[model samples]
Target: MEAYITEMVSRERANELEVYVYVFPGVYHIMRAWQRANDLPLAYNQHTIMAFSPVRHMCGYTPMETQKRHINIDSPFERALLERLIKNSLIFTAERHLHAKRVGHALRLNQVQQIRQVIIYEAIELYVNIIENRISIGFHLTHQFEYVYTLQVVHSNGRQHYTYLKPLCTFETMQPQDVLNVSKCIKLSASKRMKCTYRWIQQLRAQYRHLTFAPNPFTIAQNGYKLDQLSTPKVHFHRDYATVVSGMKTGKLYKGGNIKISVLFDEDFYLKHHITKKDIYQFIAVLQKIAIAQGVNMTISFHHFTEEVEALQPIFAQTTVLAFITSTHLSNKKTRSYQLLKQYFGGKWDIASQVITEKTIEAFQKILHKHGLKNFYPNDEQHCLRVIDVLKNESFYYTVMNILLGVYVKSGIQPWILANTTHSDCFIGIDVSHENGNSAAGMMNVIGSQGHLIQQAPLNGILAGEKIDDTLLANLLKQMIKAYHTQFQRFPKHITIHRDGFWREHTALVEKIMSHYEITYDIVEIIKKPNRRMAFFNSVDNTFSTRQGTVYQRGNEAFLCATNPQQKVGMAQPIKIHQVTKTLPFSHIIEDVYNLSFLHIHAMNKMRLPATIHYADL
Candidate 1:
């Protein structure tokens, strides 16, 4: 028994006595030696071994065993050593093994020790890590949830892709000083620790400098009342939640017309062997009915598995004909980690890695290449493609990216690639003026208030003007200037009024608003000479005559897409000034407006309200 135990410890494989020895070590000398070496307690019988020994830590064991073999201890001398080993070695090995699994992959002893030390020493700083990590472990990581429900997007180019850079939490008003203070505290602690431990802490500190994670607005869709049989509303499930939302409000919605859409309800576990085909058909039919009522001509497809390339080809073939194609599973499993809050949004609900596999990417790319999409990869196209291969079978949402973000923040890493260069103006275009006097109205329709706060004619009687023969420009300018000033006080720097109407009448209103706000303004005029050419190409054998004439244009068309309108939309023309003087954060009011309005609209649509009123009660 002594020889057998020694050989098992050295080999790190206790195959000979895998069953009995693991639960009951018969030889006292072998048990004592093993306990002394690992600093763990001695085993009295199979009962104690199964219940309290650290042998389970080193090797895996089944959890469903009902009873254990009994053993009788004859000596008090052996029991003392066993208890000492239990007190010391049990705690150490349990912590060590858990740390290794939490980090995943192999980690050096120094790495584990350092993380543990920091977790103990600077308990407050590790608040985010402890909460997020512990919750993740309790719910999904321990269960290997990423291996079950795969969340990813397989592009038509055979690229299995997921947007991984998005941060998990957002900082509303974090200052540079706050980051500096965190670095100072980490560096101070590292100075007293071992060089290796310090280096590890330093590495972690550097990763989290610019970390921000605010739940993106468009990604979450709200379903007010519950659907009858389904656990959650089917329409709420979308693979690319942020992508769809971004494209909806900023892309297609801007086009202003009936939009063609393709929706694929990729069921993960809906098709159990027990459910009949008729039942599945009935489920899909209900979805089709809901979509048609929304003014969207939708082509709905159902997939039993994620790797259904053959079934997905026809769906991709009619790509250009449809405005957007969104794919996601219908049913989402509950995560054990975040069950305490009953808020599953942050939890990694069915593993994100399994559903988004390499085959899924391959299928996606085949469809994209067939369609010939130019702007396929927005970020690093090459890097994005390569990541798709390894990323397909990995968790995209809560596992990989969320964990990566956490690690980055914990380590204080601030990679330049992760930071986005701030844009001066969100929109830029050439100013067009067809007629000398009437061009401002055309520009106003496009840039002025196309999608700003839904504006209406002013209601104040004191500001009303008498019936005048002129353009009624004074009243319009006064109301606009007043609104501009109010928005300016709240969002001063980033927002501006680019006035471009006939300068004679609108110039005074622009000056008045700028004077009231104490902002500087400028203007510029452009001059161009006419060069005419009349020619006919002989290849087509068609005669085309070109008329040559000289025309001189002046005056400004109101180029009004105020890049940050919550600031100042009605002030004056920078139609002349190319550079912005100052920039500030976009208004919080606007952010709230965008998020809340969607919730309100979704609620109204479900209630079957008429087009007459939207916010009557609220």
Candidate 2:
């Protein structure tokens, strides 16, 4: 048995031991001799080996089984083994004894050690009873109700030590039924306090398990009624300016319309797009038909460049080119050719790049502004019908006329105007631009009370910081208000300020400045990227979806779904409007914000936020 044990230890090293022999001082010489024989370095001290003995016991057999197999006192060959086994048993129990003391220290710190004391005493009595009977000695741990105890015994000629570790026990005295009932009481009280009746909570919970509940306006106002008591208003699009604009069609779009239009074809773009002389004649015929359909009679003249500029000078001198469609390559805005063209046109013509796409309408409008002109572009796509198509087939002549009429409407002429005067309130949009490695600049665009673009100015040499300089902002506002007063000949009744990024800290400074000027104003924070998620549900369809003009109100924050779902494009997210100050009625402010969304002359669809904020962002 001794030879077999030694051989097994040699093969498996320390892993073969039921309890580590290194834990016993009596086998220190044996361990050292074994290590030297195996050409292994010594790393573990006596304390380290003893600390890991319990881990070995956990991986192997129990202490009593280890003793029965490895300990034999009378045999000379096994006497050393007997001493080692006895020492391992004592050390194993001693480590657990230390573990119990540490656990007691921790429990004492928490004032819960008294409960462990009772458990340990009970464990000792049970262990003593088991040892007296000599019944195959074993450790048993059982939790009765909430009290638990564990005790292990290793006997060698009736010698044993009782060590008690931390007990797995609970001191909770409340009955499970009582605890559940108390939880019910708290939940019921909370719901009632929040004005959510038991029936409503149950219904909402049944349908949406994850929805967070908050009290609606009625509950907050203390109107003693449930949600079912109030009737929901039917949601529909308001008869705003955009609604009136959406109804205007083809020839009926322009009002102030007649102007001579001249088309200039670049030598390169004309050749690249395969424009023949016959194509030009046919394109001119389509342009004439477009002029007649829009209730406007204007002379149509087409000119081509054969690498010469002297030939077009007579036409440029005779007529103010209402619209100049030229090649993108022919007049690079920064090139010498464009500077010469600017001097040639005398800066009097609305020049547009001749790109064959629907987006060309917006591009034309932007270029018109770049050359000191303000106008609204047509949102219709039929206006971009190819001229080549109109000539090859007369079937597309009406569409071609629509396209021409759109160009005419965009030539600083109002074909048709919405009669609604709701958004006649003057407002200013403030935004800061900070380029890399440069000081920030402030941009302010003032819109007339009657929804006309007045002026946009850049306030340069402004410092970028956490808060805008008070005096700097005040000076900029003074300049804007002066410009507004000069144009309208009177101070605005109410000035609405839409700042791109606003903080609570800037509010006091702004209020101080505005109060000094005695201007009645309201500051609104337009958050493009709101961090909160608010979903709308279709009451009839039972889906979290919404359409354009869907408004949701929570406290002072209003979430407006401005994108038209009918358009059926892009992810639909709502714009969040936070009311920073209440100078105007809440509903009126919200209505104004929604109305401002339609005033983006450059955009074909409704904007995500008010045009003032959109302009500030740009």
Candidate 3:
């Protein structure tokens, strides 16, 4: 059993640390001055605010903050205070601050990465809500104080489209000079970017000077050797148009791709993107070539006219995929149109839908440049914002091919299946998503061991995050089992449940249910954003990224780098796989995961995470 070795960059650090603290009074008045101190015409000699107490993730578990806090220096302070703190040395001490009493230092949990502070593009003097009368204390988002804040956006212009549709402030901030009655805090944040090159770490070291660090960012290594070669998974496609691998593995192509597609787009969409009729036809034609070449046999029909829902209602009955196009999207006004479009698909046709817009066009162009020849179209940032013509764009072919792969798969057609099938009959990937703060829902996609979408669990009442109810999980599992039986005409003898993240597991309950059915099960946790990092030394190219499918097995767990080397900025992050069912050898699970990573129907290229988690996340 060859357990390949690779280097791991340590992110491990002490969970808790000592830090000075101080709590301030006059929640509004003091903070109002502090918040506006930045744009002052004259220099204001004051500490301002470094970090706040009751820290963001720990304190003010609600929006109404009745108390305020002051800060000076800490390794984990706002971006604005970084230079100031570094200049004066890391040690922070203050006798008194505008009548703000100093509270002795206490050990604080490392909140550096936990409490995410947003980059205040331009300070709102920001009340969290500066509206009159509704003036309150603390920050805007109540959940940020207790939970890890994930920035929530509902298809907006960033400035406008927000969770609050009615406008949090009744009037504009033009009359801002008048009212200061409020509860809120001020903090600054910068873009989070990291590069793992020696120079990048060296710059940080230079900045820190002699500052001590816990569990230094140095790479952790052990005795093992890198393999010279690894192999990619082979996949089969088509159904009615059968293909066979001489029974060695199976079909190398899809049997048949039979699905109805109706493209509904606005006339302005073409004009806005500088797309010509020829461009659209070219995109469709390339898709056809891809379909024919891949043997998926897909046909797409489209119509261009704005607000033609009634006109196109007839095609909805036969439609399986609705590709909606618009000039702009996810705006205040556009969100309603989007919802109506969704309702049209959900209520009338019961079909799947995908949006195509400028952003979408840019995404296509990016894929083209990244994986294919960049000499296609106007492949520049300035030009991509508008003119994205497919005609004469040599690079457009690659973009359309990738798009075809995704669309073909979405049409309920499996382009390929992993030949590396195991004893596990089904791979069920489950994950949860939340909106606003508290409300959440889940999605689960079940794939047969052969690597085809068996069924997308009609996940309902799925509980997650706050409380993962056993009843909800059991119900979901029941549905999954039923779907599998319907597909294969028998209950799976061995099934594997792939949980997307660090959610609490219910192995005992799972075993209890599987026991009665005389079934065996395996549970695996897939962490996409692992604190761990791995570097594969390419003796040939002198690159750090390892060859795709590099697996370093460690007992019941392993780290798999299922991605090719990225020539772009950030390094590829290897995924960690923990096989909860310790019975099976870790190699089996690692190979299964490394193979599934190639099953992403969206693109022919290797994906960072496996198709199971990617589909569940989508």
Q: Is 2 or 3 the stronger prediction by lDDT?
A: 3
- Give the Å error, residue 265, model 2: 2.7
TM-score winner between 2 and 3, please give it.
Answer: 3
- Full ranking by lDDT: 3, 2, 1
RMSD (CA, Å), candidate 1 to true, equals: 32.9
Model 3 score (lDDT): 0.46
Give the better candidate number (1 or 2) by TM-score: 2
RMSD of 2: 28.5
- Tell me the deviation in Å of residue 362 in model 2: 20
Off by over 4 Å in 3: 1-219, 222-230, 238-253, 269-286, 296-302, 308-318, 321-394, 434-440, 460-464, 489-491, 503-505, 537-543, 553-555, 616-618
TM-score of each: 0.20, 0.44, 0.54
lDDT of 1 at 565: 15
Please report, in order, the local distance difference test score of every candidate based on alpha carbons.
0.25, 0.42, 0.46
Residue 441 CA displacement from its true place in model 1, Å: 38
lDDT per residue as tens, model 2, 1-618: 000000000111222233332333222553444344533222233322322232321322222222213322344433334333333332234234322111221111011112322321111101111111111111111112112335442211111223234223322443434444333322312112212222222332234211223333112122111111111111112222234223322324434456666655445534454433443443454455445544666565556544455654644664434332345543355654455455543321223322222234334334434544332223222432333223333333333434553454345543432244443367787655321122345667787643556667775544553565677777777788788879888877788887666553356766776787677888776666542222333336433333456555645666565665442242345566777777787556666767666653432334566656455222
Cα lDDT tens digits, model 1, 1-618, are: 000000000111111111222433133444555555645434444233422334423323342332332222344433333333333332344234433222222122222112211211221011111111111000010111011112342111111233232121112222334433333433421112222332333343233211222221111111011111101111111122233222222222211122232333334223332222343333233223322322233353332324335443435443211111112321222422123111211122122321222333344444434445322332344533443333334332122232222222112221111011122211111122221212211212111111223223311221222222224444554454455546544422222332222123345654665567554443322111111111112225422211111111111211111111111121111111122222322222122112221221211111111111112110
